[PDB]
Design an enzyme around this catalytic site. Structure first.
Site, PDB file in Angstrom:
ATOM      1  N   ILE A  59      42.562  35.987  29.621  1.00  0.00           N
ATOM      2  CA  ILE A  59      42.959  37.173  28.768  1.00  0.00           C
ATOM      3  C   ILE A  59      42.944  38.693  29.424  1.00  0.00           C
ATOM      4  CG2 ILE A  59      41.628  38.843  27.547  1.00  0.00           C
ATOM      5  CD1 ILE A  59      40.345  34.935  28.199  1.00  0.00           C
ATOM      6  N   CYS A  60      44.188  39.248  28.919  1.00  0.00           N
ATOM      7  CA  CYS A  60      44.446  40.927  29.136  1.00  0.00           C
ATOM      8  C   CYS A  60      44.082  42.204  27.923  1.00  0.00           C
ATOM      9  CB  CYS A  60      46.456  41.010  29.719  1.00  0.00           C
ATOM     10  SG  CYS A  60      46.524  42.606  29.675  1.00  0.00           S
ATOM     11  N   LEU A  61      42.966  42.247  28.801  1.00  0.00           N
ATOM     12  CA  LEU A  61      42.043  43.749  27.441  1.00  0.00           C
ATOM     13  C   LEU A  61      41.587  44.567  28.499  1.00  0.00           C
ATOM     14  CD1 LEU A  61      41.186  43.789  24.420  1.00  0.00           C
ATOM     15  CD2 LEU A  61      39.254  42.348  24.993  1.00  0.00           C
TER      16      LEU A  61
END
Ligand SMILES: [Zn+2]
Ligand SMILES: [Zn+2]
Lengths: 109, 76, 83, 93, 85, 99, 148, 99, 82, 108, 94
Positions: free
Chosen positions: G85-87
């Site tokens: 995840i890239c958040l």
DNA sequence: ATCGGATGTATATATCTGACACGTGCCTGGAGACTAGGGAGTAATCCCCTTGGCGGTTAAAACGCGGGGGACAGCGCGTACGTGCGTTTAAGCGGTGCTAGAGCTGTCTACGACCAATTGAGCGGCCTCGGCACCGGGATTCTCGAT
DNA sequence: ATCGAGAATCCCGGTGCCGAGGCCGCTCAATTGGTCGTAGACAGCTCTAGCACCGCTTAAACGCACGTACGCGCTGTCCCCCGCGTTTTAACCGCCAAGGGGATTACTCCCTAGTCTCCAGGCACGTGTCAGATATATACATCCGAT
């Protein structure tokens, strides 16, 4: 020179030249150390030490003693003008202070 | 025993289900009350999809709970 | 083995002698408390850095090199104790 | 045991070269060692910085000469620069 | 005029407020909650997302973190809750 | 009838005598106890080399002597002979030690 | 300890007010392990696909964000097939005030529109940016073949 | 008949106005000419960049402002409100600039 | 050749600097002392700046040289590189 | 933390970890540089920068402005008792001084 | 064109856009902040280098930078900087 | 302006002791020969910007005068501090005993430097629109001579 | 205690401009992957000196009394910066024009780091002896009360 004697003796320098070169190399000062820098630095160090020692010896001689002591070193450093400015922040152990009394505090006539 | 079930359309309805009822029993009751076919239906609670092979007695579900219903569109 | 009120160990004649070395002829009666406070502040400043230096090296006894390095860091170089 | 290095012999040789009769005690000897180390660190650090400024990577003689000019006051600076120039000229030939 | 125990609980701990501290944004938090946030969180107000590092530094040296009014109110209204903790 | 000096001259004699010697004016054990107390206030269970204590005492003596020199300079500038705490405060403030 | 009370309150307030289109609950007997089921938004090419998310909770909450991972492969510029995840809100902008409901609804909102400002995987984001139709078709077939 | 302020009530206004702004105080060309004259002794036919001259002017202004603050403190310490050369000399000596 | 330029530091300029410093009454002998100390400071900074320029085999006193000379003297300056 | 993300975002900073690492390695500081040093250094640098900027912005808002100018930086630095001690011996160009007037000089 | 000269302009701007979302910064202030960052970085790195050298080591680990930060900054600033750096490194390592 | 006490300081001599100057073994760091390659010196070219000059206009500096406020000198007071003496207190010195901890040595294992492909972060250049500088009129507020 | 006139300062509104922020093209430095020599982490041993205690001096600190001289407040005088009005000077802005040298690129060469081998310079240890500190006894400079 003739490239025959030791480097310290080759340049007529009492202070060592190889030790200064090693210290410059392994002191994290630069990626490279030139072949002429240590000689110059050792010469500067020897000259400074000679000046301080001459002044200290004169001060000790004026005090009727033949052994240099830190009090004589402090007198020699403080009484001079250039060496006082160069070493204006250092604190010589057992050096005392120069003798001076303010003109105001002296007794009246 | 009253239980809440809510579909993907945001509608929540109340059904009487005893703890001993199986999941297929709940599906049959759902057919009885509206008739939405059970094949497209999947039941979700506590992060686990309910399995018809286990009775609700062993599922440890208390009163007034809410279940989730997700429709599996057969085709597309 | 704790200690208390050791700043009073810097007795009034000692401050008198230090002032006389400094070149002072007449000393007021309120100088001593101010001098004790100043000395305590300076000691705290030096000792903090010395203890930090000896703590980084994972040692337990503060040494002369640590004290002289703290003094050099504060800008007061000290000669006659190595380094 | 371990071997620790110091400038004792060289300073004593210079002292005998300037005053053939006077002697030096231990405390003055340690003081002289500390002074030599301090001056060495000052000059070498200034030379290293000055060499880094011009996007160089070596410390030639002229970096040390300019560091000496920067650090020491006037008369001492001139005398030390002259002495170093004489030393390097004698060494190189 | 007097808040009840329902509004007196920590918004992050859900327990009766113990040693409250008031943020510049007029937000009250329990002392252990504040310490845990400053030690591990992003050093910002959980509710307003505004840095309190300047205020924290200014009030730490003088030990001005504590709020006497709310602490006195809570300790007098519910002494049992404070004592049991 | 007994011979006593006019108040002021033996202070000058002490100034002349104490500016030639180079001993340590503060006593040894009280200073050692003070430095140990401060250190234990910083980090508990600490040990001191004697050289460290000597170096600390030398540094403190030199600093105090310099401060008293500047304090006397201020006192003489104010047309007095008695140094007062305001003079020490002014000297420290000018030196930049406390601002 | 206190995390136990926090998780008890979280399960209670998820139970009393279940979120719409998202269903979250603990698969394991322990409270730390968690599972979430998300169904794609109506205005999206994810119709007919449900996605499962595994959640592991740290020993300390809510100061440390809970780890999450995709059980099924997802084709999206934000979401790699591997499951990372890239958040920003999960780690960089995490604060104790956030709840699991907030992060799950944020993920649901993200599923509607891709974000190419910080593409974790460059080629899929570039393909989506080139044209919407091809990305829509590949996403539809991907969510049909894998999710169902 | 003409309206004249009391002596010493407009100097405070000058203090208030000048402590509020940031612009340079000394004129630019006189400072540049002084810098060039001082520099030509060390090395002839030198050239200067405007940025260097501006930096020199800023540094000199800051140094003089600080020195004048110290001089004001020294003068007030002696129960006066007027600065005199002895105040500047005492401040410089305490700071240790001229030794 | 240039000469007699310390007079460019006028009396009003020194008065303005002192007013910024926060003084009320200025005697008539302050100006000469101020000019002297300013000349000393300029000499001290310019010597180091010119030496730095000379080492680099350049012929213009770049702002960087002045900045590093000021940093060496202990009065580091912000706003011109560094 | 998980890999496959840029170093500056691995620990959630804004200052460059790679540039700081390169500066430490090629700056003549030590023969070897650890892998955790640049991250820690960048963290300290970013924290100090944010600490300065917060007070600078507060001063700018106080002065009814929206663009930070060096005067705001000087006000922010000098008004803080600990930042003033850190930047004791620095001169900020175009900064001015704090407004103060000795109580003796005030009129009766 | 000219050579590529580096600075911390974009990083300072990004940091500023967090504390104050709606406050710009002039060019002179940007240069001042750049110089400040360079000065602090050089101070910390030099102190760490000397500290590592005093112990006959060859690596500037995180502990040397931590002790240098502890020495250089005053009390509260030192504590906060140490906390921030420790949090950053423990986030980076896992 | 001294003169005589009376005090403290400076000077000459015996003496004896511990630190300094020197000698010795040796081993680790310095010296010598050789090789490879990258850093620096040198030549050539471009164009940025630094110096120089001319003209106007006007803010700023120079000069002079009235005077009121402050610097400086002299006097008187009493209170704090210096000086000497008797007394109580703990530093200073010696000797002994013990062990925590500094310091040295051997293993080896994981962290960090080097090297090649590459791709995106960040820098150079452009452009535009909004915050801020500025001008003009008005409201507000310290200030002082006069009551 | 106050009232009011003249003057400086702050608010508000409209106008214009230049530079701050955002966008685009791009070139080079950070990223990733793999390998290899070694830095220091650890366990173990030694043995140094730092800590604790005890007894005996006598040197330094402490409390006290008496006197005196210096800080401080007060008063008076005079003189010198200050505030203000008028005149003279060059700072400042814009403009033009030249060329000096800073900045960059390409090429070549030679200085130095790395490696190996060999050996003597200086470092730790031991030892003899005299430079200086200490005690004892005179010689003299200096202070203070009083003529
Ligand atoms: Zn809480
Ligand atoms: Zn808030």
């Amino acid at each position: 020179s003739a490239k025959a004697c030791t480097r310290s003796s080759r340049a007529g320098l009492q202070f060592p030249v190889g030790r200064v070169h090693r210290l410059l190399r392994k002191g994290n000062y630069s990626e490279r150390v030139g072949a002429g820098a240590p000689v110059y630095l050792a010469a500067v160090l020897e000259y400074l030490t000679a000046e301080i020692l001459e002044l200290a010896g004169n001060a000790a001689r004026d005090n009727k003693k033949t052994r240099i002591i830190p009090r004589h070193l402090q007198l020699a450093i403080r009484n001079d003008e250039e060496l006082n400015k160069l070493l204006g922040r250092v604190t010589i152990a057992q050096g005392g202070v120069l003798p001076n009394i303010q003109a105001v505090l002296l007794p009246k006539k | 025993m009253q239980i809440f079930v809510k579909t993907l359309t945001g509608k929540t309805i109340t059904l009487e289900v005893e703890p001993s009822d199986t999941i297929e029993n709940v599906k049959a009751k759902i057919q009885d009350k509206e008739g939405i076919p059970p094949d497209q239906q999947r039941l979700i609670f506590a992060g686990k999809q309910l399995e018809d092979g286990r009775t609700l007695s062993d599922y440890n579900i208390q009163k007034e709970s809410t279940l989730h219903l997700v429709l599996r569109l057969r085709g597309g | 083995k704790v200690l208390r009120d050791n700043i009073q160990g810097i007795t009034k004649p000692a401050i008198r002698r230090l002032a006389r070395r400094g070149g002072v002829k007449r000393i007021s009666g309120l100088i001593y408390e101010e001098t004790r406070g100043v000395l305590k502040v300076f000691l705290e400043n030096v000792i903090r850095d010395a203890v930090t230096y000896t703590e980084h090296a994972k040692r337990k006894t503060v040494t002369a090199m640590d004290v002289v390095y703290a003094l050099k860091r504060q800008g007061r170089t000290l000669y006659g104790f190595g380094g | 045991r371990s071997r620790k290095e110091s400038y004792s012999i060289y300073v004593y040789k210079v002292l005998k070269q300037v005053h053939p009769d006077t002697g030096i005690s231990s405390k003055a000897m340690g003081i002289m060692n500390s002074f030599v180390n301090d001056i060495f660190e000052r000059i070498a650090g200034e030379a290293s910085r000055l060499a880094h400024y011009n996007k160089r990577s070596t410390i030639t003689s002229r970096e040390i000469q300019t560091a000496v000019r920067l650090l020491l006051p006037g008369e001492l600076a001139k005398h030390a620069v002259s002495e170093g120039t004489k030393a390097v000229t004698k060494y190189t030939s | 005029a007097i808040p009840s125990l329902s509004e007196c609980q920590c918004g992050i701990c859900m327990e009766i407020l113990v040693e409250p501290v008031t943020l510049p944004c007029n937000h009250t938090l329990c002392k252990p909650c504040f310490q845990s946030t400053v030690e591990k969180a992003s050093l910002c107000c959980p509710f307003c997302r505004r840095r309190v590092s300047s205020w924290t530094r200014y009030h730490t040296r003088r030990n001005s973190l504590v709020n006497v009014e709310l602490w006195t109110i809570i300790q007098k209204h519910y002494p049992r809750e404070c004592k049991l903790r | 009838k007994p011979h006593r000096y006019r108040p002021g001259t033996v202070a000058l004699r002490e100034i002349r005598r104490y500016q030639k010697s180079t001993e340590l004016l503060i006593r040894k054990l009280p200073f050692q106890r003070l430095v140990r107390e401060i250190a234990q206030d910083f980090k508990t269970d600490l040990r001191f080399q004697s050289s460290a204590v000597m170096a600390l005492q030398e540094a403190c003596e030199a600093y105090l002597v310099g401060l008293f020199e500047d304090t006397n300079l201020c006192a003489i500038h104010a047309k007095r002979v008695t140094i007062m705490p305001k003079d020490i405060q002014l000297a420290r403030r000018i030196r930049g030690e406390r601002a | 300890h206190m995390a136990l009370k926090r998780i008890n309150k979280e399960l209670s307030d998820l139970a009393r007010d279940p979120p719409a289109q998202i269903s979250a609950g603990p698969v394991g007997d322990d409270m730390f392990h968690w599972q979430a089921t998300i169904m794609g938004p109506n205005d999206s090419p994810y119709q007919g696909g449900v996605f499962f998310l595994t959640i592991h909770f740290p020993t300390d909450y809510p100061f440390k964000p809970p780890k999450v991972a995709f059980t099924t492969r997802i084709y999206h510029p934000n979401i790699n097939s591997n499951g990372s995840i890239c958040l920003d809100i999960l780690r960089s902008q995490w604060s104790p005030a956030l709840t699991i409901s907030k992060v799950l609804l944020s993920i649901a909102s993200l599923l509607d529109d891709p974000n190419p400002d910080d593409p974790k995987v460059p080629e899929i984001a570039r393909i989506y940016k080139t044209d919407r139709d091809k990305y829509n078709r590949i996403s539809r077939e991907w969510t049909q073949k894998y999710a169902m």
